[PDB]
Amino acid sequence: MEIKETYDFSSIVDLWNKNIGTVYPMNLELFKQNYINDRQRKKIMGAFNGEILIGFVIYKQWTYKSGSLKPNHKIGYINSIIVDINFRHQGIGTKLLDAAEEELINSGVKILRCGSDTYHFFPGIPLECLPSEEFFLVRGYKMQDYFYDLIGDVSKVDFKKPSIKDGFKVNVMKPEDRKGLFEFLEKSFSGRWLEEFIEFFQVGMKERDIVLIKYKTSVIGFSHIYDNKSSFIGPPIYWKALLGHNYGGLGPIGIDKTYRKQGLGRLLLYESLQILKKREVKKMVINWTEKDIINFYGRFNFMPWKAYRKATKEVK
Amino acid sequence: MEIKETYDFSSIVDLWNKNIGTVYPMNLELFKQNYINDRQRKKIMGAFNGEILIGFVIYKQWTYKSGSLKPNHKIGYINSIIVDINFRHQGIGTKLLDAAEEELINSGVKILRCGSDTYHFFPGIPLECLPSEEFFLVRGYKMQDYFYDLIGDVSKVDFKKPSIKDGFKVNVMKPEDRKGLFEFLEKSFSGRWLEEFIEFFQVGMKERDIVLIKYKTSVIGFSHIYDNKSSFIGPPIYWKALLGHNYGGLGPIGIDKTYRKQGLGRLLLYESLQILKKREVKKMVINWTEKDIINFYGRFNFMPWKAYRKATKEVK
Numbered sequence: 295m296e297i298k299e300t301y302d303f304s305s306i307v308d309l310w311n312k313n314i315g316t317v318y319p320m321n322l323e324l325f326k327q328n329y330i331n332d333r334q335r336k337k338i339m340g341a342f343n344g345e346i347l348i349g350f351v352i353y354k355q356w357t358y359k360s361g362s363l364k365p366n367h368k369i370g371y372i373n374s375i376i377v378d379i380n381f382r383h384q385g386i387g388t389k390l391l392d393a394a395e396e397e398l399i400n401s402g403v404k405i406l407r408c409g410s411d412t413y414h415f416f417p418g419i420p421l422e423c424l425p426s427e428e429f430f431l432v433r434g435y436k437m438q439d440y441f442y443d444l445i446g447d448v449s450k451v452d453f454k455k456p457s458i459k460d461g462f463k464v465n466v467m468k469p470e471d472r473k474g475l476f477e478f479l480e481k482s483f484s485g486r487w488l489e490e491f492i493e494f495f496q497v498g499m500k501e502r503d504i505v506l507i508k509y510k511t512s513v514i515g516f517s518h519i520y521d522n523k524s525s526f527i528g529p530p531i532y533w534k535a536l537l538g539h540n541y542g543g544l545g546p547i548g549i550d551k552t553y554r555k556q557g558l559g560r561l562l563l564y565e566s567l568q569i570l571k572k573r574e575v576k577k578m579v580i581n582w583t584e585k586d587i588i589n590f591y592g593r594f595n596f597m598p599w600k601a602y603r604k605a606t607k608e609v610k
Numbered sequence: 611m612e613i614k615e616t617y618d619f620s621s622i623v624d625l626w627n628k629n630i631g632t633v634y635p636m637n638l639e640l641f642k643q644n645y646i647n648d649r650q651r652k653k654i655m656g657a658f659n660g661e662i663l664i665g666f667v668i669y670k671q672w673t674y675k676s677g678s679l680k681p682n683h684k685i686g687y688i689n690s691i692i693v694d695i696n697f698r699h700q701g702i703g704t705k706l707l708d709a710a711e712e713e714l715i716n717s718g719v720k721i722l723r724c725g726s727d728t729y730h731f732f733p734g735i736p737l738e739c740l741p742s743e744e745f746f747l748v749r750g751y752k753m754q755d756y757f758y759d760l761i762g763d764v765s766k767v768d769f770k771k772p773s774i775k776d777g778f779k780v781n782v783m784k785p786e787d788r789k790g791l792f793e794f795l796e797k798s799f800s801g802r803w804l805e806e807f808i809e810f811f812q813v814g815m816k817e818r819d820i821v822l823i824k825y826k827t828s829v830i831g832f833s834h835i836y837d838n839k840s841s842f843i844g845p846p847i848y849w850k851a852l853l854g855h856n857y858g859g860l861g862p863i864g865i866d867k868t869y870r871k872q873g874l875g876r877l878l879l880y881e882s883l884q885i886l887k888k889r890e891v892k893k894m895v896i897n898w899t900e901k902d903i904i905n906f907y908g909r910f911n912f913m914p915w916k917a918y919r920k921a922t923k924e925v926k
C-alpha cells in the first residue's frame with residue numbers, strides 16, 4: 295500500500311461511484327470542473343495497491359482571496375475522503391487523513407473543516423456518511439450543526455402572486471446589469487458570493503441564470519438559478535442524476551440586509567421559481583440551507599432532502 | 611372548512627403526492643394494501659373546503675393482537691398527517707390532530723406515537739418533514755432517537771463469503787419449511803414479526819421472499835427479501851419509484867437469541883444479498899435500522915438513505 299499524489303480523475307470518479315454513487319452520483323465533467331477551477335492550494339493524495347487506486351483524500355488550504363476578503367491561511371479543508379469498501383478497516387483512511395492534515399498543519403492551518411470548501415462536493419459530513427462521524431470524532435473533529443439541501447417539484451404547485459409592492463421589479467439579468475450587480479455584491483455580499491460571481495462568469499455562467507430584484511433602478515437582491523441548459527454545474531445541480539430530466543436548482547439567493555424581513559426575499563423567491571417553472575423545470579434543489587430558514591423555502595413546498603453535519607478540528 | 615371522516619383513497623394519494631411525493635412517492639396500490647389490511651382500530655379524518663380534501667390524518671389504536679402478545683390499548687399512532695401546501699398555517703393540522711387525539715384518548719390511549727404503526731408508512735418523523743418536529747413538540751410529543759433506512763446497489767460490489775461453522779446452511783424457503791419457520795418465530799420472535807408472517811402470507815407474500823438459515827434441520831434465523839416480483843409491497847420497497855429498475859429490499863432479519871454474536875447474521879445477510887444479486891437486483895433498501903447496527907450493513911456497502919425521528923406524547 296503506497297500513499298502518493300494522484301491526478302487520475304477517472305479512477306477517482308469510478309471509486310467514488312462504486313462506494314457512494316447511489317446517493318452522490320459523480321461524473322467526470324463535474325469532478326474535473328470542480329477540481330480544475332478551484333484556486334486554493336489543493337492536492338489529491340491517493341492510496342495505491344500497486345497501480346490500483348483504493349482510496350483518496352482531496353484537501354485544500356485557504357490561500358486565494360474571497361472577493362474583498364484576503365485568504366485566512368489558518369483554515370484548511372477536507373474536500374472529500376473515501377477508501378474503497380473492500381479495503382476498509384486496514385488503516386488506509388487514517389494514513390490519508392494523516393497525510394492531508396500533516397501537510398496542511400505544516401503550512402500553518404489551525405482550523406480543519408469537513409467540506410464547505412470552494413468548489414465543494416459537500417457542505418459538511420453527509421448523513422449518508424453518518425458512520426464516518428465516528429472516524430472523524432476519534433481524530434479530533436467536533437460535530438456541530440447541520441446544513442440541508444432542499445428538494446421540491448415546481449411543476450406540482452401553483453402559488454398566488456405575493457402582495458404587489460410599489461417600486462420593486464424582479465427580472466432575469468441582462469448584460470447591462472453586470473455593473474449594478476457587481477456594485478451590489480461589493481456592498482452586501484462581498485466575500486464568497488462576490489467571489490463566485492467573479493469566477494463563475496469566467497467559466498461560462500450566463501446572464502439567463504441570474505435573477506435580480508430591483509427597487510426602481512437599484513439591485514437589492516439576486517438569485518442564481520439552474521436548469522438542464524445551464525453549462526456550469528453548480529452546487530444545486532451537482533446530484534442532477536437524481537433529479538430527472540427537467541432538473542433545476544436555486545442558490546445562492548440574497549437580499550441586502552437593509553431590505554430583509556419585509557417580504558422581498560419572498561418576492562424574489564416566488565418570481566425565481568416562476569421563471570424556472572416557465573422553463574419547464576420539475577424536480578429542483580435549493581442547496582446549503584440552515585435549519586432556521588427551511589420554512590422560508592417550505593412555504594413553496596421545498597423539503598429537506600440531504601443533510602450535512604458541520605465538522606471542525608482545531609489544531610491544539 | 612369541515613373536519614370529517616373520508617373514504618376517497620385516490621384523493622388522499624394525490625394530496626400526499628402533491629405535498630411530499632418527491633421524497634415519499636405514494637400510489638393507490640401501496641396505499642390500499644397498507645390501509646385496508648391493517649387490523650387495528652383505524653380511521654382517516656379529512657379536512658375539506660366544500661367537496662375538496664385539503665388535509666388528512668390517519669390514526670390507529672393498538673387493538674389487534676401481535677403474535678402471542680395481546681394489544682396494549684394504551685398505545686395510539688399517528689400513521690400520517692398532511693395539510694395541503696396552499697392551506698398551511700390556518701389551524702387545520704391542529705384541528706385534525708385535536709380530533710384524532712381526542713378520539714384515541716377517549717378509547718383509552720395514553721401514549722401517542724409518530725409512525726411505527728402496523729402497516730406504517732413511517733417509523734418516525736421523516737427528516738424530510740423535519741419542520742413538523744416543531745408542530746409535534748408544541749403538542750407535547752418528545753423528540754427521541756433516530757431510525758434509518760439504508761440503501762445499496764448490490765450489483766456494484768462483490769464480497770468474500772464469511773467463514774462458516776459446519777452444520778449451518780442457508781436456503782430460500784420451501785413450502786415444507788412453513789411449520790419449522792412458525793415454530794421458530796413462536797420461540798424467538800413471537801410478537802410483531804410472527805404477526806407479520808401470519809398476515810403477510812395471507813396477502814401475497816410467497817416463500818421465495820424468505821431466506822432461512824438452519825443449524826442442521828432446525829430453523830435458527832430468517833430474512834425477508836423483496837424484488838420486483840414480490841406481490842406484497844413491504845416496507846423496504848415502499849418508495850421503489852425512487853430505486854429504479856430492478857429494485858429490491860431486505861428486512862426484517864432475525865437470528866434466534868441463543869445463536870447471536872457468532873457471525874451467523876453476517877452469513878445470513880451475505881447469502882440473502884447473493885440471492886438478490888443473482889436475481890439481478892440493483893438498488894435496494896434495508897429498512898428501519900438503529901444507529902448502532904448501521905456498520906453491520908455498512909460492511910456490505912449500505913449507507914443511510916432516509917432518517918426518521920421517534921416521537922412520543924404521554925397523555926397527561
Ligand SMILES: CC(=O)SCCNC(=O)CCNC(=O)[C@H](O)C(C)(C)COP(=O)(O)OP(=O)(O)OC[C@H]1O[C@@H](n2cnc3c(N)ncnc32)[C@H](O)[C@@H]1OP(=O)(O)O
Nearest residue numbers: 374375376377382383384385386387388408409419423426
Ligand atoms: C468530508 C467527507 O469526505 S465526509 C465523507 C467521508 N467519507 C465517507 O463516508 C465514505 C465512506 N467511508 C469511507 O470511505 C471510510 O469508512 C473512511 C474513509 C471514513 C474510513 O476509512 P478506513 O480506511 O476504513 O479508515 P481506517 O481503516 O484507517 O480506520 C477505521 C478503523 O479501523 C481501525 N483499523 C486500522 N487498521 C486495522 C486493521 N488492520 N484491522 C481492523 N481495524 C483496523 C482503525 O483503528 C479505525 O478505528 P478508530 O477510528 O476507532 O481508530
Ligand SMILES: CC(=O)SCCNC(=O)CCNC(=O)[C@H](O)C(C)(C)COP(=O)(O)OP(=O)(O)OC[C@H]1O[C@@H](n2cnc3c(N)ncnc32)[C@H](O)[C@@H]1OP(=O)(O)O
Nearest residue numbers: 690691692693698699700701702703704724725739742745
Ligand atoms: C407521523 C407524521 O405524520 S410525520 C409527517 C408530518 N407531516 C408533514 O410533515 C407533511 C408536511 N407538513 C404539513 O402537512 C403541515 O405543515 C403540518 C401537518 C405539519 C401542520 O399543518 P398546519 O395546518 O400548517 O398546522 P397549523 O396551522 O394548525 O399549525 C401550524 C402553525 O401555524 C400557526 N397556527 C396555529 N393555529 C393557527 C390558526 N388558526 N391560524 C393561523 N396560524 C395558526 C402556529 O404558528 C403553528 O405553529 P406551531 O404548530 O409550531 O405552534
Ligand SMILES: CC(=O)N[C@@H]1[C@@H](O)[C@H](O)[C@@H](CO)O[C@H]1O
Nearest residue numbers: 486529544545546547581582583
Ligand atoms: C440557499 C443559499 O443561498 N445557499 C447558498 C448556496 O447556494 C451556495 O452554494 C453556498 C456557497 O456560496 O452558500 C449557501 O449559503
Ligand SMILES: CC(=O)N[C@@H]1[C@@H](O)[C@H](O)[C@@H](CO)O[C@H]1O
Nearest residue numbers: 802845860861862863897898899
Ligand atoms: C433491519 C430490520 O430487521 N428491520 C425491521 C424492519 O424490516 C421491519 O419492517 C420492522 C417492523 O417489523 O422491524 C424492523 O426491526
Ligand SMILES: C[N+](C)(C)C
Nearest residue numbers: 356360411412486
Ligand atoms: C474559502 N472560502 C472561505 C470561501 C470557503
Ligand SMILES: [Cl-]
Nearest residue numbers: 615616653654
Ligand atoms: Cl376512515
